[PDB]
Amino acid sequence: AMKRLLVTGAAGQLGRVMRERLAPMAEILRLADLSPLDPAGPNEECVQCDLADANAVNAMVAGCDGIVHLGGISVEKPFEQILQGNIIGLYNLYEAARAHGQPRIVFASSNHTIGYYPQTERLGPDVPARPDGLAGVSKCFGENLARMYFDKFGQETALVRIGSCTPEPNNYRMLSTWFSHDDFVSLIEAVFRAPVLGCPVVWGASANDAGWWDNSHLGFLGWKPKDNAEAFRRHITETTPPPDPNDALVRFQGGTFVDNPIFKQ
């Protein structure tokens, strides 16, 4: 599919998965993270750098034909860390791409951009943001920045609002939010194969009977997820306590993130 694909956040949980699963997409896979990476094998390059370091990010991106941007802060943390990984880091990534041929980007956004919506409300891609903490706010920043680079320079980005990308659903909320490895992989393949992408919002979930999100406007991309969290409903009842109706886990799309305070260093 391409000569060189960059995967950032490659030492993280999703990154380790994609390091294996996206190998067939490119002759060379370049893996990057702030954290130490397992050594490069055949057809791999490994890079260590902070997203907040502009010169390092420039070098990280140079020579890459595509980027799967998983690197950054995924859970609620103090502002200082979010600022570095998700705000400054995003600016540096977009500037680096702009300097090196505008390789297409798959951005790991988050359901936390809309975490304060009730689970009873079905959402299209144009709904106003309701971020459930600083992490969500920073993912909104990434989306707004990507949109600006698209309108201004034509840089294309898939804004993937990831639900819960896990080996299997493991609580009641994931019956709605589960995004299987297979379905995220197929989405990434669909994003890179498209002649024209634009800067679309993509709801990152499998084809769950209990899904909250409407991807119908993305029809042009031809991506239909195949897995379905509903198959795990009994598994969940037989492995977890029944949710309290007052629990954020079943009240808000962001789940317990709404209960987070502003964390401090």
Ligand X SMILES: NC(=O)c1ccc[n+]([C@@H]2O[C@H](COP(=O)([O-])OP(=O)(O)OC[C@H]3O[C@@H](n4cnc5c(N)ncnc54)[C@H](O)[C@@H]3O)[C@@H](O)[C@H]2O)c1
What residue ranges bind a second copy (CB under 8 A)?
Answer: 79, 83, 87-88, 91, 95, 98, 116, 119-122, 126-134, 136-137, 140-141, 144-145, 147-148, 151-152, 172, 175-176, 193, 195-196, 198, 200, 208-212, 214, 216-217, 219-224, 230, 233, 237, 242-245, 247, 250-251, 258, 262
Select the binding partner of residue 133 from a second copy, ligand X, none (C-beta < 5 to 8 A, by kind): a second copy
What residues numbered 81-120 form the site for ligand X, per CB under 6 A?
A: 84-85, 89, 108
Select the binding partner of residue 6 from a second copy, ligand X, none (C-beta < 5 to 8 A, by kind): none
Q: How far is CA 3 from CA 21, 64, 132, 137, 226, in A?
A: 16, 8, 38, 34, 28
Pick the piece of the chain touching ligand X (CB under 6 A) from 6-14, 38-46, 132-140, 225-233: 6-14
Q: How far is the CB of 154 from ligand X (least distance, A)?
A: 26
User: SS3 breakdown of the chain: % helix, strand, coil, rounded to 5?
Assistant: 40, 20, 45
| Number of residues assigned to the chain | 265
CB-based contact 105:156 (threshold 8 Å)? yes
CB-based contact 10:39 (threshold 8 Å)? no
CB-based contact 170:236 (threshold 8 Å)? yes
Cα-to-chain-centroid distance, residue 123: 18
Q: How far is the CB of 55 from ligand X (least distance, A)?
A: 13
The footprint of ligand X (CB under 6 A) covers 9, 11-15, 33-35, 50-52, 70-74, 84-85, 89, 108
